[PDB]
Design a protein around this motif. Structure first.
Motif, PDB file in Angstrom:
ATOM      1  N   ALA A  41       0.931  -1.080   0.012  1.00  0.00           N
ATOM      2  CA  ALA A  41      -0.052   0.004   0.147  1.00  0.00           C
ATOM      3  C   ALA A  41       0.832   1.287  -0.192  1.00  0.00           C
ATOM      4  O   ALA A  41       0.546   2.257  -0.528  1.00  0.00           O
ATOM      5  CB  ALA A  41      -0.976   0.139   1.182  1.00  0.00           C
ATOM      6  N   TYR A  42       2.113   1.152   0.561  1.00  0.00           N
ATOM      7  CA  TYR A  42       3.001   2.460   0.592  1.00  0.00           C
ATOM      8  C   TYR A  42       3.476   2.698  -0.597  1.00  0.00           C
ATOM      9  O   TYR A  42       3.348   3.781  -1.172  1.00  0.00           O
ATOM     10  CB  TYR A  42       4.053   2.057   1.708  1.00  0.00           C
ATOM     11  CG  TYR A  42       5.061   3.447   1.576  1.00  0.00           C
ATOM     12  CD1 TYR A  42       4.777   4.595   2.130  1.00  0.00           C
ATOM     13  CD2 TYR A  42       6.372   3.313   1.053  1.00  0.00           C
ATOM     14  CE1 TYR A  42       5.701   5.964   1.887  1.00  0.00           C
ATOM     15  CE2 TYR A  42       7.080   4.280   1.088  1.00  0.00           C
ATOM     16  CZ  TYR A  42       6.663   5.569   1.563  1.00  0.00           C
ATOM     17  OH  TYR A  42       7.570   6.755   1.416  1.00  0.00           O
ATOM     18  N   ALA A  43       3.809   1.729  -1.303  1.00  0.00           N
ATOM     19  CA  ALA A  43       4.510   1.969  -2.874  1.00  0.00           C
ATOM     20  C   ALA A  43       3.354   2.565  -3.708  1.00  0.00           C
ATOM     21  O   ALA A  43       3.470   3.311  -4.607  1.00  0.00           O
ATOM     22  CB  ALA A  43       4.638   0.574  -3.540  1.00  0.00           C
ATOM     23  N   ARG A  44       1.807   2.115  -3.401  1.00  0.00           N
ATOM     24  CA  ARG A  44       0.887   2.628  -4.387  1.00  0.00           C
ATOM     25  C   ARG A  44       0.835   3.966  -3.891  1.00  0.00           C
ATOM     26  O   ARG A  44       0.295   4.912  -4.642  1.00  0.00           O
ATOM     27  CB  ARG A  44      -0.411   1.921  -4.098  1.00  0.00           C
ATOM     28  CG  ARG A  44      -0.321   0.475  -4.777  1.00  0.00           C
ATOM     29  CD  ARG A  44      -1.800  -0.338  -4.839  1.00  0.00           C
ATOM     30  NE  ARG A  44      -2.226  -0.570  -3.576  1.00  0.00           N
ATOM     31  CZ  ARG A  44      -1.856  -1.888  -2.795  1.00  0.00           C
ATOM     32  NH1 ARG A  44      -1.066  -2.744  -3.663  1.00  0.00           N
ATOM     33  NH2 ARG A  44      -2.234  -2.308  -1.657  1.00  0.00           N
ATOM     34  N   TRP A  45       0.896   4.383  -2.534  1.00  0.00           N
ATOM     35  CA  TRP A  45       0.770   5.846  -2.268  1.00  0.00           C
ATOM     36  C   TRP A  45       1.742   6.537  -2.812  1.00  0.00           C
ATOM     37  O   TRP A  45       1.559   8.037  -3.224  1.00  0.00           O
ATOM     38  CB  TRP A  45       0.783   5.855  -0.806  1.00  0.00           C
ATOM     39  CG  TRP A  45       0.503   7.169  -0.262  1.00  0.00           C
ATOM     40  CD1 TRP A  45      -0.666   8.036  -0.009  1.00  0.00           C
ATOM     41  CD2 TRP A  45       1.609   8.254   0.355  1.00  0.00           C
ATOM     42  NE1 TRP A  45      -0.233   9.145   0.532  1.00  0.00           N
ATOM     43  CE2 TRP A  45       1.093   9.501   0.505  1.00  0.00           C
ATOM     44  CE3 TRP A  45       2.883   8.067   0.427  1.00  0.00           C
ATOM     45  CZ2 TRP A  45       1.741  10.535   1.132  1.00  0.00           C
ATOM     46  CZ3 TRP A  45       3.783   9.122   0.703  1.00  0.00           C
ATOM     47  CH2 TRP A  45       3.154  10.322   1.028  1.00  0.00           C
ATOM     48  N   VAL A  46       3.054   5.999  -2.798  1.00  0.00           N
ATOM     49  CA  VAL A  46       4.353   6.870  -3.564  1.00  0.00           C
ATOM     50  C   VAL A  46       3.896   7.284  -4.894  1.00  0.00           C
ATOM     51  O   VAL A  46       4.113   8.333  -5.325  1.00  0.00           O
ATOM     52  CB  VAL A  46       5.490   6.179  -3.343  1.00  0.00           C
ATOM     53  CG1 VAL A  46       6.549   6.945  -3.942  1.00  0.00           C
ATOM     54  CG2 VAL A  46       5.919   6.174  -1.777  1.00  0.00           C
TER      55      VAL A  46
END
Ligand code: BCL
Ligand code: BCL
Ligand code: BCL
Ligand code: BCL
Ligand code: BCL
Ligand code: BCL
Ligand code: BCL
Ligand code: BCL
Ligand code: BCL
Lengths: 358, 358, 358
Positions: free
Chosen positions: A336-341
């Motif tokens: 989810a963090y990679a998608r947020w980045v």
């Protein structure tokens, strides 16, 4: 096409809002600048000059190279609040482009005005984001007319001011916000007023004639514009008990972009109420503006974030959730963090909240 | 989803700026037009009429079909510079939509004005891009009122002009820039002034009443607008020693876009100083505007560029670098060039510079 | 990242324009809201009140939760056409945010004006899309000043109206279109006029003082704005022979968006001329606006559309073409339709036309 990036935040504890911030990114896509290669370095320093009065000495040094031409800007300014709404600045500096340079000195005041603030909003919204307002600038500036290029430009502007009537302060806006800067104004829900010129005169300075102008403008925002919505927060003079500084640089050309940022400064964490603290809300303008260039090439994300809390502190809430923890050290990557980045690099403003406490 | 494209440039040598240009693209994505299928062909011709005076005969023929309705536009215009800033045009033409048509004749002048040009900029920047300015149009146009649709529309406008006061020239802008054209104005850092109507009268022509209007407007740009930044360059009358022409067409529907362009014209190469020449700087408006539609579907790039230099010439600098060379013939494909093609198709303005010499 | 969605349309036959509409989507990307989680439910009902006069009782209930704060809005309004261009509304409602609430009542008129309509356009274009115009609002509204927050805000506005001169109606626009709403105005080729305040007074109501304001504004569109281009079509009172309703809800946070819509309403199909009917042209504003958020994460499409025609009817034309047919039931998935779904989710307005008949 892979974007590689790394970010690190190291927080001070107690009543401190300070943090060390580090950012690195490298991506092998062309920059959008229509002159390449383009490189740039920036350093900003702030130190308390007179803590009793709350006066800060703020400097900035910018050096760049654009299609082989070297540019510099140096500014030294003393800044202080007079009231919670009015801030004053007195400074001087110089700029150079290739073989040309000129200096300047100025005095200015800026008044921030929120539109229709209410108690009903304040007591019901725990973390308000969009705050609409308008911000008035009053500027006195002085430039020695000490070469013929300066004299020529001075005369050109005198003609326009004298002859142009209401058109001058209107049409100056597409001169001022050169290239893609003009389009970015509306993109951020921002407005720039026409300029009003109060006076423009030649004075006899020590070493020759000096062009002296007093002028005014305002800009407004619907709430995305952080300069207005977060006026007080953006100048944390009360926490500046020691020098702060940040340094950044990039190199770009038609086959890649590389960027580094290193800083140590107050305002990285904030009281979130009830014993909790948060990493400061993400400013919106940078995301919205960068968003205008972040959609030109497909990329995958290779990105880690490391946050190091003060000893004994723990994260109470994070969304997206961290991937791993080792005592006070927390790491985000993938999922989810990679998608947020990806989201924020393309102009998204979705909230990533981090709350921590003892 | 794969975008297939091919481009070719064949340059003349010596003091010539002429080149042959060919472009082909096919991509299997829907066009964004809210009426489909839509097809269109355009031909533009320019020939020297009076080289001693610098008068050019410029024609344009446009034919299109939109949701089965056939449209045409034909214009023939004589164009010349009066000064480096003022250009005049005299022409006539007609248009048709389905069963309806009307003709027109006009005389106009356009004056280009740069804002605050300086010697300090000129001598220090070897390849300037953003030049801010404003461009004034003065138009006299005549349309025979030779059917009742024309008479009805004439009367409608007379009512608005007479009764609408300042509103007419203001509100006409959202009529004029129909559909998504209005949003594209700000996107390019462009401004359109209100229209001023000087006179609007019925005259007795040979074959009946003629509606005659004299009106004015200006448009301005922060530097992205090539019509202003590159005013002189965009009308290379000095190099038009023979007829020039370009032809283009596209076919589009909900499952694909196909486009062809073929031309032969001056201005494809330019002196870059010190014995070097370059392919002309890429105009920005087309990239910015196309950028508004180029982000709706993911695609991969299958694209080649071929540049054929005059015999004995060699590329001195190219970034992105060419993939192969066979004597005077240079080819780009894949790698950094493919990433650049993706970039500009989505609205990016990153520089691709090609410098060549003997 | 996969976007899963399903849509269903079930049509009534004969002279009916009614259809049942169902939509579901789930995508695991962050929403762009800078406060998350955010959830929202909306229900809209319309019932004939007085069919002989054409009066419709229109209600709306909105409930949301934003960063744990609960908001509601309820409005009940009686709406009717006075002429084909003028519509009137009389209603009342309330809103609440956390511990605060206030009610309101209003009377208003809206007049739609197309700019320069012509017979030559009407008879030659079988399915017109962009129609430019301006739409005038005249509003009388009353709000009981029955707590001190209301009194404070009332006084703040009185000060601005009295003292602000022309600035008040100008600057109110960046207050009104909070956050990213301001930028979206130009994106859709829309314009909002300054507000004019005709009167603002305190009246003695039954249960205390009431703030009463009469004010006006207009908005305009270049043709994308459906509120103007499709004024009559958007209020199909003639087909409302029974109650209509639609319900929708979403849940969003930093790791996904889920949405449901269920409705039954007239206006889903339209006469297309010559015995054919079509699904109504897609409204443009929703696509353009959603387009401002639909480009922040790469996604693949997993999407089906099911259209169930009335018994005995058949699709005469569809592009993109349906994948399968079972008597009156038609299904779209994959291929060209999937590319079209990607296109419109990112802001594209390419036509998907469906024509059907007996
Ligand atoms: C950017 C959004 C707004 C704006 C918002 C603000 C805000 C907010 C403030 C000012 C203030 C000032 N503004 Mg202003 N200002 C704008 C445009 C202008 C223009 C112009 C021609 O465009 C001018 C002449 C001015 C003029 C001025 C001066 C009167 C004054 C001090 C400027 C200075 O020292 O700069 C020198 C600085 C630079 C050249 C570079 C600054 C780069 C960015 C903005 C730094 C961001 C902080 C960074 C993330 C963190 C730094 C941490 C370090 C460790 C310290 N503004 C635009 C429209 N302006 C300040 C003041 O003191 O007023 C009394 C103030 O508080
Ligand atoms: C004249 C300029 C104004 C001013 C205008 C702004 C504006 C506007 C903003 C801030 C923001 C912040 N400022 Mg301030 N700020 C000023 C003075 C200060 C002083 C001080 C005591 O003098 C301090 C310590 C701070 C500290 C801070 C932080 C609270 C915050 C950035 C947080 C962060 O994580 O950054 C970490 C930094 C990074 C991740 C990137 C740093 C990149 C480079 C090195 C600096 C920015 C360059 C900028 C993008 C481009 C400049 C172009 C100009 C033409 C030169 N400012 C003066 C008064 N400041 C931001 C914020 O979030 O406010 C709520 C914000 O938007
Ligand atoms: C394209 C990338 C996005 C971006 C992506 C991210 C991501 C991803 C994360 C953060 C995180 C944070 N970011 Mg951010 N961030 C951007 C821009 C900014 C700016 C700003 C003034 O531009 C500020 C104040 C902040 C502030 C913050 C904090 C709220 C937070 C903790 C610091 C950190 O990790 O920094 C990291 C440092 C950077 C991302 C470097 C940004 C450098 C920008 C682009 C400016 C470069 C200026 C250049 C060198 C000089 C320009 C000169 C002119 C041409 C004259 N960001 C840009 C636009 N940011 C983290 C967070 O939310 O933690 C909870 C996090 O995970
Ligand atoms: C496009 C950006 C600017 C603009 C920029 C310019 C520029 C720059 C010039 C004019 C000039 C003219 N403009 Mg103007 N003009 C604009 C909008 C308008 C509008 C309007 C209602 O919108 C009107 C009525 C006019 C009216 C006019 C005439 C007075 C005059 C000749 C027009 C003509 O022959 O067109 C007939 C042409 C067409 C119908 C199609 C043109 C298509 C594009 C623009 C061609 C691009 C060149 C192509 C890439 C290369 C061709 C190579 C061939 C081999 C020759 N302009 C917009 C706002 N205008 C010209 C002149 O001579 O002024 C005295 C001139 O130099
Ligand atoms: C009335 C119109 C104006 C005018 C306005 C412009 C504008 C504006 C531009 C140019 C540009 C150029 N023009 Mg000029 N130009 C005029 C007259 C001329 C004459 C002449 C002697 O009459 C010539 C030879 C040229 C030649 C040139 C080139 C120097 C250059 C395009 C380079 C290229 O590679 O194109 C190769 C062509 C292609 C790859 C694509 C061709 C596509 C089609 C066939 C033509 C364009 C259609 C356009 C996108 C849509 C038109 C919509 C209208 C509503 C009809 N123009 C008149 C005076 N010209 C461009 C430039 O780069 O300037 C620096 C530019 O932006
Ligand atoms: C979406 C694709 C991009 C684009 C992508 C590229 C790429 C990729 C390359 C160039 C290259 C070049 N392009 Mg470019 N280019 C675009 C649009 C333009 C326009 C213009 C007036 O629109 C001009 C003058 C130019 C000019 C140029 C030269 C600087 C250069 C050499 C010619 C060439 O290869 O052409 C190639 C021909 C085309 C790309 C065809 C473009 C056709 C455009 C989209 C207009 C179609 C008009 C249509 C048929 C009719 C419209 C009618 C109206 C609806 C009424 N481009 C569009 C917007 N261009 C090359 C270069 O930089 O060499 C060093 C190169 O590699
Ligand atoms: C949205 C684009 C335009 C606009 C376009 C229209 C149109 C078009 C109409 C009005 C009408 C009205 N407008 Mg207006 N209006 C705008 C902005 C405003 C603002 C404001 C402060 O921004 C105000 C105070 C008003 C005020 C008003 C009232 C005088 C009147 C009835 C409103 C109502 O009942 O709402 C209560 C409704 C809601 C709170 C939610 C509505 C949500 C959306 C718009 C519903 C879309 C339909 C949905 C897809 C299908 C529903 C099917 C159901 C089965 C029935 N408008 C913007 C600028 N307005 C209507 C009228 O009757 O005028 C006399 C009318 O016809
Ligand atoms: C005060 C509001 C105005 C009004 C303004 C609009 C506007 C504006 C539009 C419509 C549109 C339509 N309206 Mg109407 N409409 C009103 C009254 C009615 C009445 C009635 C008899 O009272 C009926 C039956 C209709 C019926 C219809 C359809 C013909 C059409 C939607 C087709 C569809 O497939 O939707 C199926 C629905 C969906 C797929 C999605 C539904 C989503 C949710 C549940 C409702 C919309 C919420 C919106 C996006 C956000 C609202 C934010 C506000 C701040 C609250 N309206 C009043 C008079 N209506 C649209 C259209 O296409 O017109 C040609 C359109 O753009
Ligand atoms: C991002 C997705 C796109 C979209 C993608 C598609 C696709 C794909 C298809 C259609 C189809 C149709 N759509 Mg659409 N559609 C959108 C928005 C709308 C709106 C509107 C008022 O927003 C309307 C009236 C319509 C109308 C229509 C009809 C013309 C047609 C048949 C109904 C259907 O299948 O609905 C399906 C229902 C939906 C797509 C749900 C849309 C819900 C929107 C996003 C509003 C949610 C409101 C929310 C719950 C509450 C907001 C509250 C505020 C925050 C206060 N669409 C959004 C912006 N639409 C179909 C078609 O063309 O058939 C021929 C089709 O295949």
């Amino acid at each position: 096409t892979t974007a590689h990036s790394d970010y690190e935040i190291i927080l001070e504890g107690g009543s401190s809002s300070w943090g060390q911030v580090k950012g690195r990114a490298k991506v092998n896509v062309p920059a959008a600048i229509p002159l390449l290669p383009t490189d740039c370095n920036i350093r900003i320093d702030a130190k308390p000059l007179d803590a009793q009065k709350g006066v800060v000495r703020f400097t900035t040094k910018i050096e760049s190279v654009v299609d082989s031409v070297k540019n510099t800007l140096n500014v030294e300014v003393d800044i202080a609040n007079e009231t919670k709404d009015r801030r004053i600045a007195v400074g001087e500096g110089s700029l150079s482009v290739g073989d040309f340079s000129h200096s300047f000195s100025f005095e200015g005041s800026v008044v921030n005005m929120y539109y229709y603030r209410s108690d009903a909003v304040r007591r019901n919204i725990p973390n308000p984001i969009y705050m609409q307002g308008r911000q008035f600038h009053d500027i006195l500036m002085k430039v020695p007319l000490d070469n013929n290029d300066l004299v020529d430009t001075w005369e050109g502007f005198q003609q326009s001011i004298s002859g142009g009537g209401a058109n001058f302060g209107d049409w100056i806006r597409e001169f001022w916000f050169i290239g893609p800067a003009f389009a970015a104004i509306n993109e951020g829900g921002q407005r720039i007023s026409p300029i009003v010129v109060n006076s423009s005169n030649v004075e006899g300075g020590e070493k020759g004639p000096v062009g002296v102008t007093r002028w005014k403008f305002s800009h407004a925002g619907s709430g995305v514009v952080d300069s207005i919505s977060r006026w007080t927060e953006l100048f944390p003079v009360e926490q500046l008990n020691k020098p702060a500084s940040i340094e950044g640089g990039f190199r770009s050309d038609s086959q890649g972009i590389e960027v580094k940022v290193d800083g140590n400064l107050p305002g990285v964490s904030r009281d979130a109420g009830g014993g909790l603290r948060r990493i400061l809300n993400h400013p919106l303008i940078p995301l919205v503006h960068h968003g205008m260039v972040g959609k030109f090439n497909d990329f995958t994300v290779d990105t880690q974030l490391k946050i190091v809390l003060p000893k004994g502190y723990k994260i109470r809430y994070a969304a997206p959730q961290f991937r791993s923890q080792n005592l006070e050290e927390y790491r985000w990557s993938g999922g989810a963090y990679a998608r947020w980045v990806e989201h924020v690099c393309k102009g998204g403003t979705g909230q990533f909240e981090v709350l921590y406490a003892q």
